[PDB]
Design an enzyme around this catalytic site. Sequence first.
Site, PDB file in Angstrom:
ATOM      1  CG  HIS A 134      47.337  82.796  62.308  1.00  0.00           C
ATOM      2  ND1 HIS A 134      47.745  82.902  63.621  1.00  0.00           N
ATOM      3  CD2 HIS A 134      46.807  81.555  62.181  1.00  0.00           C
ATOM      4  CE1 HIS A 134      47.505  81.763  64.248  1.00  0.00           C
ATOM      5  NE2 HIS A 134      46.932  80.932  63.399  1.00  0.00           N
ATOM      6  N   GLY A 140      49.050  79.530  71.525  1.00  0.00           N
ATOM      7  CA  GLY A 140      50.425  79.199  71.233  1.00  0.00           C
ATOM      8  C   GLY A 140      50.636  77.842  70.594  1.00  0.00           C
ATOM      9  CB  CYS A 156      48.624  78.255  65.796  1.00  0.00           C
ATOM     10  SG  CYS A 156      47.033  78.855  66.328  1.00  0.00           S
TER      11      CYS A 156
END
Lengths: 300, 300
Positions: free
Chosen positions: A41, A143, A145
């Site tokens: 993503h 941020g 991830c």
Amino acid sequence: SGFRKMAFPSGKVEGCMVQVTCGTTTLNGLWLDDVVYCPRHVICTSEDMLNPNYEDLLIRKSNHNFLVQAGNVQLRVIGHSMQNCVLKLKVDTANPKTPKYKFVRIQPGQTFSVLACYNGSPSGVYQCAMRPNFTIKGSFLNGSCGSVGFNIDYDCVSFCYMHHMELPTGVHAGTDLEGNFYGPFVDRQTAQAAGTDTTITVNVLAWLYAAVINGDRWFLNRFTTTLNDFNLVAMKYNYEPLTQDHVDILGPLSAQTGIAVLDMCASLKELLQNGMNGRTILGSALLEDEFTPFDVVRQC
Amino acid sequence: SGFRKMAFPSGKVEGCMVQVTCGTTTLNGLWLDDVVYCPRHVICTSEDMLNPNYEDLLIRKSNHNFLVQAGNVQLRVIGHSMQNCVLKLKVDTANPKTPKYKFVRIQPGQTFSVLACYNGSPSGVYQCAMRPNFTIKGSFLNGSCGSVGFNIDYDCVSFCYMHHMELPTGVHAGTDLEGNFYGPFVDRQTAQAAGTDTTITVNVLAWLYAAVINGDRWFLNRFTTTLNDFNLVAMKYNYEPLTQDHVDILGPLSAQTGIAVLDMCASLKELLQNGMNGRTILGSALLEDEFTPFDVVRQC
């Protein structure tokens, strides 16, 4: 002596953390050999997240749309592919700091260390357990991830978790490093039910063993129980069932402490039925379940 | 979101951990530039520890009596000296992995990360707080002495703690990196009293702020109190007094959460006077005090 929630030393994973930018979205990726692994993503805008079609979105992306930076050094993306919910970015240089590693899918109840990162630079490290409902109770701001979880066996980093999202409930979800999510979750912004977070019984018992070893013994009773009788009580209190496998795993703690597992099981029953009455075990007012028996043994 | 007890990434200190052997005694040392720092009781046998005279014992030691190994590589000791309770071993090569560093003496109530090591190889990392009585509640088996504590500011490692001993009470004691012990303790095997372990009030308040930020709010009341009235209650419950300095430090959490510090102080009073009644805050049944306000802010 003493007993602490301890993470593995993070230096070997630190050397793998890079920044991956795709459009206005920046997360972390894992640079091992000449492949960067990151959450797919990264290719999503905020509005895509509501219902993304990753294949259609990925077709619109080229290698040059992916900025990968390791510290200040820029890697050349020469290939991109989607392994389930992970992007594999082929880059032009092999990470000279690639440690020995394997990708592993751990089981519910197992623990690992997380190197939380922002913009590809490590921020902190902590030990977490994979909940029975395949969530983790981590600490992840926007941020983070792509931050990864790992265990270490001598010189080898076993990557077991990569972070993808926070569910609307506040718990965290991610994938193994081949991108298959733990639990029924997907990388889309929708209501997603996490399971009943049951308690990891085998871990509770190990921590009691850790407590007995560290001299916290007040909770020992002289009772025993059976495995089925104990498990009847366990379910009512939303504890995962105890298996012979788990009993087998606790053997060394049973052998090192001189406390039979079923005796230890009986003590836990009494804590369950009577509460701790405000007393503490290893400085905690709750039964701790984010230590596996291996965690205890390593530390002891 | 989420809130975890998080240690600093340990990679920069990992590259400094070496094994120091002197006779039958092995502990860890810190290799920074061309100096290895280790606990001076590396020169002690078990029987010396009862009442060691370190100057007389050190005169019997030469540079060649000190085996220092960084991984498999052997350093040549070309000088030895005693900085208070630390040995400075001059070695023949500068650590190419020396990070930028400073030696700092922290204050009671401050937190740091520990890289626990055995035979100079890092084993685990965890976040600890310096107790008001200048002990730490760590996890240290035999051979972990010389493991260090540190904070990180961008690219700089601030060494603040080096471990020397476990007191007969099970708590741990050590020095700054110039070897001056925190607290009235010495590196000798005798009964040594630790102080009343009072609670670090400012840290409790920061964690409540962390809790409110993370959505745990049930403990908020609408009461206020004064600073002196609150401190009267604090002493009875063995909490360190709250100063204006601490109030000043909590300002950003007060400003970020919209909860005045004295309102937050009033909530804590109610938790103190009524207990938590079995409820939890951030998954803990106790008031947590091993987060400074800086810890909270960094994570938030």
